[PDB]
């Protein structure tokens, strides 16, 4: 995965959106397309509408998910059984 | 070949002794061009046999061979236009080859803790004419 010399990664616009939201206490779901952004502790308690190729999925951040990538919580494929 | 027939490739004599039969033996034993391994095994087995019975390594080996050499075969040829299992003579060269192949086959099955030991015990059984080597010959005869 990403080197430690490098440090974690996040997309800037998402960072500003979340920072502004938390200062404001607006706490409305955030539309975003940044599956590759990493989760930082501050985002706990927020809600992110994450694009899944088709649609933006609601997600409720919690401290456990810290360190994961957002795309990890929005499946892009569908399946229900061949039979 | 359909057009013609061609001679059999000449094979060198073993340098240690010079018995071409031994060279053919190591060849029929060798696997994936590991000739050195094969000759090592052969020498080990030959010693552990000849110095536990018989007089001489080469002579003991040869007599052991002779005790298993076949004389007849049954493999079918379409002589009469169909797969007749006609029994015909076997060439002395072919008799030697069959004996050698049978004895080497037996040892692989014998399962002692070393291939040198398997080979030595098989060849001792052959010298004693009590072993599967003579069995294959006599089953062919039967």
């Amino acid at each position: 995965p990403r080197s430690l010399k490098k440090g974690p990664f996040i997309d800037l616009h998402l960072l500003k959106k979340v920072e502004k939201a938390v200062e404001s206490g607006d706490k409305k779901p955030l539309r975003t397309w940044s599956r590759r952004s990493t989760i930082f502790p501050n985002m706990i308690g927020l809600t992110i509408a994450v694009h899944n190729g088709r649609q933006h999925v609601p997600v409720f951040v919690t401290d456990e998910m810290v360190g994961h990538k957002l795309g990890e919580f929005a499946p892009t494929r569908t399946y229900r059984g061949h039979a | 070949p359909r057009r013609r027939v061609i001679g059999q490739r000449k094979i060198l004599p073993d340098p240690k002794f010079g018995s071409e039969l031994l060279a053919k033996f190591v060849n029929i034993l060798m696997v994936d061009g590991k000739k050195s391994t094969a000759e090592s095994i052969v020498y080990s087995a030959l010693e552990t046999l000849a110095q536990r019975s018989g007089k001489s390594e080469l002579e003991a080996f040869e007599v052991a061979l002779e005790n298993v050499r076949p004389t007849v075969e049954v493999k079918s040829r379409r002589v009469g236009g169909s797969t007749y299992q006609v029994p015909v003579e076997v060439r002395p060269v072919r008799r030697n080859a069959l004996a050698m192949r049978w004895i080497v086959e037996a040892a692989r099955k014998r399962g002692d803790k070393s291939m040198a030991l398997r080979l030595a015990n098989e060849l001792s059984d052959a010298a004693e004419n009590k072993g599967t080597a003579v069995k294959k010959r006599e089953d062919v005869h039967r």
């Binding site: 456990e64 998910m65 994961h68 990890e72 919580f73 499946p75 039979a83 | -």
Partner: protein, 115 residues
């Protein structure tokens, strides 16, 4: 003969023996033997009880069998409960690190069964 935990190593060379412990591979085995200052190829049998005691001390410095199993179970449970894609795959008994599922998945899916 027994080391820490309910496991009797059999009476072979010590390293091979110790690997029996769930959580002790070859590397940990060599490390343990070096720490105890014991030749690796001695039989499990014939060691004084003090030597086996110091070895019992050595293995204590690692996560023991019964707790290693619990740790792994807890980790997998955490991932399962979290709901992450990787966790969702675990509950479906499917390859969990990106191998083709069209073919060559018997070790995870199990023996084939007809439609």
């Amino acid at each position: 003969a027994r080391i820490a935990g309910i496991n009797i190593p059999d009476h072979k060379h010590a390293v091979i023996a110790l690997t029996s412990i769930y959580g002790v591979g070859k590397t940990r085995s060599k490390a343990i033997l070096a720490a105890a200052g014991i030749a690796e190829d001695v039989k499990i049998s014939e060691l004084s009880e003090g030597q086996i005691d110091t070895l019992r001390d050595e293995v204590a410095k690692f996560v023991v069998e019964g707790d290693l199993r619990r740790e792994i179970s807890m980790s997998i449970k955490r991932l399962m409960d979290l709901g992450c894609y990787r966790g969702l795959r675990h509950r479906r008994g499917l390859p969990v690190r990106g191998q083709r599922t069209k073919t060559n998945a018997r070790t995870r899916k199990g023996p084939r069964k007809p439609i």
